[PDB]
From a paper:
Human paternally expressed gene 3 protein (PEG3) is a large multi-functional protein of nearly 1600 amino acids with a mass of about 165 kDa. Consistent with the presence of a large number of zinc fingers, PEG3 has been shown to bind DNA in a sequence specific manner, and has been detected predominantly in the nucleus, supporting the notion it is a bone fide transcription factor. PEG3 contains a SCAN domain near the N-terminus. The domain functions as a protein-protein interaction motif, mediating self-interaction and binding other proteins.
Here, we report the structure of the isolated SCAN homodimer from the human PEG3 protein (PEG3-SCAN). Crystals of human PEG3-SCAN belong to space group P65, with a VM value of 2.44 Å3 Da−1 and solvent content of approximately 50% for an asymmetric unit comprising two polypeptide chains. The crystals diffract to a resolution of 1.95 Å and the majority of the residues are located within well-defined electron density, apart from a few residues at the C-terminus. The human PEG3-SCAN domain folds as an extended V-shaped structure, with approximate overall dimensions of 50×25×25 Å. Helices α1 and α2 which form an N-terminal sub-domain are aligned antiparallel to create one half of the V. A C-terminal sub-domain, which forms the other half, results from α3, α4 and α5 being packed together. The domain aligns with the N-terminal sub-domains interacting with partner C-terminal sub-domains to form a dimer with approximate dimensions of 50×37×30 Å. The free energy of dissociation (ΔGdiss) is estimated as 19.4 kcal mol−1, and suggests that this assembly is thermodynamically stable, consistent with the observation of a stable dimer in solution. The human PEG3-SCAN homodimer is held together by an extensive network of hydrogen-bonding, salt-bridge interactions and van der Waals forces. The majority of these intermolecular contacts are formed between α1 and α2 (the N-terminal sub-domain) of one subunit and α3 on the C-terminal sub-domain of the partner. A hydrophobic patch comprising Phe49, Trp74, Leu75, Ile85, Ile86 and Leu89, from α2 and α3, make van der Waals interactions to equivalent residues in the partner subunit.
Numbering used by the authors: 1 to 90
Write the structure that this text describes.
């Protein structure tokens, strides 16, 4: 159903290793966070791969374009590519 999956993406990426918690509990947490981000029960392996490609692409955007790309929120790669095909001379 509708969720803030990006909240979980950020938590997954920003979780820190806390010695008091230790390795097994840290694995459990990471797994829960990644599943609440990617919701594999709703998506195919192919769709998941596309999300990972999008995640990486968003990080490598030239810095001068990042505010623009994010104001726009392209929700998939194709979008992002057609957008950068028309946003660049900045």
């Amino acid at each position: 159903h509708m969720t803030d999956s990006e909240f979980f993406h950020q938590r997954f990426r920003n979780l820190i290793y806390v010695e008091f918690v230790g390795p097994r509990k840290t694995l459990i947490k990471l797994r829960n966070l990644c599943l609440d981000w990617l919701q594999p029960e709703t998506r195919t392996k192919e769709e998941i791969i596309e999300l990972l490609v999008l995640e990486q692409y968003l990080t490598i955007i030239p810095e001068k374009l990042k505010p623009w790309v994010r104001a726009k929120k392209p929700e998939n790669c194709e979008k992002l590519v057609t957008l950068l095909e028309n946003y660049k001379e900045m």
